[PDB]
């Protein structure tokens, strides 16, 4: 019973959900299929909850169901035999990653134009090159780190120097409470496939200079019971 790793227990309020949540999502999607006319698939791989809430508040009449890929695959039907309605696994197979499956009764073209005109700012999200380039100045670094006049900003907090020095691999010293470096550290170049620590550096300095525009792949109509594929971003 021994020579194991002890699980670090902590005492919080929230608790795991289990199979009841998944069955609830299953029943919800299956009862909304009968209700609404059109159903769409939206690939939302890395999002902010306020952006998702904006997308949801854009229509209180239409539904948006997130959840687990394999659960929505089962609700729709992955096999041509196992399916709720006809030609539905043809849609269910399109789901790739984080899929937000939307239901509506609204016209095709309103949705199509909305989800290509909708664009927001977001972080650069590693494994994705960034359209920016940053040499930090070679003096004292500020909370924005080379984005505005330093006379606006204040120096960052001394508590971040272990983080910058170890996790971000920046060469860092501090003279009094201020953080300092000797030479201008370049972090990234445009058209350079980003890595985790570059992304974290840009996040720490507060750089949302990437275009979040949701991708839509397919679309299915209940009365026609047909699929239709439109890669629109």
């Amino acid at each position: 019973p021994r020579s194991k790793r002890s699980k670090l227990v902590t005492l919080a309020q929230t608790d795991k959900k289990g199979r009841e949540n998944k069955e609830r999502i299953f029943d919800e999607v299956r009862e909304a299929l009968d209700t609404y006319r059109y159903v769409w698939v939206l690939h939302l791989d890395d999002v902010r909850t306020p952006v998702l809430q904006e997308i949801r508040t854009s229509w209180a009449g239409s539904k948006l169901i997130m959840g687990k890929r394999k659960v929505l695959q089962k609700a729709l039907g992955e096999k041509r035999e196992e399916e709720y309605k006809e030609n539905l696994y043809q849609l269910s197979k399109l789901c790739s990653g984080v899929t937000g499956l939307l239901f509506t009764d609204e016209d095709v073209n309103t949705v199509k134009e909305y989800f290509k005109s909708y664009v927001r700012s977001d972080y650069s999200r590693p494994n994705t090159k960034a359209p920016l380039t940053f040499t930090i100045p070679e003096g004292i670094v500020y909370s924005r780190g080379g984005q505005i006049p330093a006379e606006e900003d204040v120096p960052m907090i001394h508590s971040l120097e272990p983080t910058m020095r170890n996790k971000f691999e920046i060469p860092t010293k501090i003279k009094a409470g201020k953080i300092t470096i000797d030479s201008p550290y370049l972090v990234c170049t445009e058209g350079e496939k980003l890595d985790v620590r570059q992304a974290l550096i840009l996040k720490q300095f507060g750089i949302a200079a990437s275009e979040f525009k949701v991708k839509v792949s397919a679309y299915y109509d209940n009365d026609s019971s047909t699929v239709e594929s439109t890669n629109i971003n």
């Binding site: 020579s3 691999e169 060469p171 000797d182 030479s183």
Partner: protein, 187 residues
């Protein structure tokens, strides 16, 4: 429970050549060669096809299985060191007394010489190990880089450096002078 047979796989890239009689292991690649004795271990080796070498243990327990996994890890480290290499960057810091770090060749032995640590006249000498190369990093204040293929020798020399300059009978909350490992990685 006396597992009837347990196995681990070792991947060999194209430039690397691995030679294994009884439990001696020779690994040759671009950056050089490496040798290691594993006769203490009592496992079995075998080859599949020029890129995959398997190590096996028959009728053994928990400690034997652990020895299998760490053998795999050691051979993988050898391959990584002969292909890419190991590079450890250390930085030496001071508040008042500038620590002077130099190299000396004494009887052809390559000692590292540290002077004036916290204001002492003692001269701290650290022998450099074979397969380790010291250079003083340019355009970076008070940094020294140890490069080689033996991660063991490189890390142990860095440890010797950061241990020889330990502070004695002083609050380390106040006295920050020392030599510390800044970065580990490849070449």
């Amino acid at each position: 429970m006396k597992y009837i047979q347990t196995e681990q796989q070792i991947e060999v890239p194209e430039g690397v050549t691995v030679s294994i009689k009884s439990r001696i292991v020779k690994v040759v690649g671009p950056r050089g060669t490496l040798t290691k004795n594993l006769k203490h271990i009592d496992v079995t080796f075998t080859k599949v096809n020029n890129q995959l070498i398997k190590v096996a243990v028959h009728n053994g327990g928990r400690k034997h299985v652990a020895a299998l996994r760490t053998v795999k890890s050691l051979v993988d480290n050898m391959i990584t060191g002969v292909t890419k290499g190991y590079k450890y960057k250390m930085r030496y810091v001071y508040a008042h007394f500038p620590i002077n770090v130099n190299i000396v060749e004494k009887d052809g032995a390559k000692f590292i010489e540290v002077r004036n640590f916290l204001g002492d006249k003692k001269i701290r000498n650290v022998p450099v190990r074979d397969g380790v190369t010291i250079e003083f990093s340019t355009n970076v204040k008070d940094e020294i880089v140890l490069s080689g293929n033996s991660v063991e020798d490189v890390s142990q020399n860095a440890a010797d450096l950061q241990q020889i300059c330990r502070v004695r009978n002083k609050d380390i909350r106040k006295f920050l002078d020392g030599i510390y490992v800044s970065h580990k990685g490849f070449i």
